[PDB]
Amino acid sequence: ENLYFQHMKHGRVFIIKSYSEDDIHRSIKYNIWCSTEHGNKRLDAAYRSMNGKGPVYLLFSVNGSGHFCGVAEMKSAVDYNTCAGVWSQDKWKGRFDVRWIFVKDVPNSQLRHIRLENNENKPVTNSRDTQEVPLEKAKQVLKIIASYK
């Protein structure tokens, strides 16, 4: 068995959607990310109010690719005033640190049966950027990602 995730109460988990494969590669290389304004605001609030008591995990997926590509942990608050134009599109304002945990492709077929009660019971694989995942569903997703091969 594997009960690593039992009794974990502090932890928050979000979907990250990237239109760009390039941005994924740059995030893996330099351990940084940036979301939309409302996306950054959601993550910064969860990171700050967690106050080191647990992790904020990020489940990355390239829109249209049909698979999740990895897991990272958020490792800083959002700096909203940073160099512009470092990503594929000039849409994103700011930067925060991440630490990538898993880089592996996990087909949506492995995850589509987990549904998010906070998003109209939709499959977790039909989420938008910074969709938050309830902790109990997030544990199921993480166990799947870690044990896929």
In angstroms, how far apart are the furthest CA atoms of the chain?
47
Q: How far is Cα 149 from Cα 127, in angstroms, rounded to an integer?
A: 23
| 75 HSE (CA, 13 A, CB side) | 13
19 binds ligand OYK (CB under 6 A): yes
CB count, 10 Å around CB of 9? 7
61 binds ligand OYK (CB under 6 A): no
92 binds ligand OYK (CB under 6 A): yes
Q: How far is the CB of 135 from Cl ion (least distance, A)?
A: 4
Angle made by CA atoms 100, 74, 145, in degrees to the nearest 5: 50
100 binds ligand OYK (CB under 6 A): no
42 binds Cl ion (CB under 5 A): no
Tokens of 34: 């940036």
Q: Is 18 within any annotated ligand binding site?
A: yes
17 binds ligand OYK (CB under 6 A): yes
With CB under 5 to 8 Å by kind, the binding choice for 128 among Cl ion, ligand OYK, none is Cl ion
Tokens of 25: 């590669």
- Binding residues vs ligand OYK (CB under 6 A): 17-20, 23, 34-36, 87, 92, 129
- Binding residues vs Cl ion (CB under 5 A): 17, 128-129, 134-135
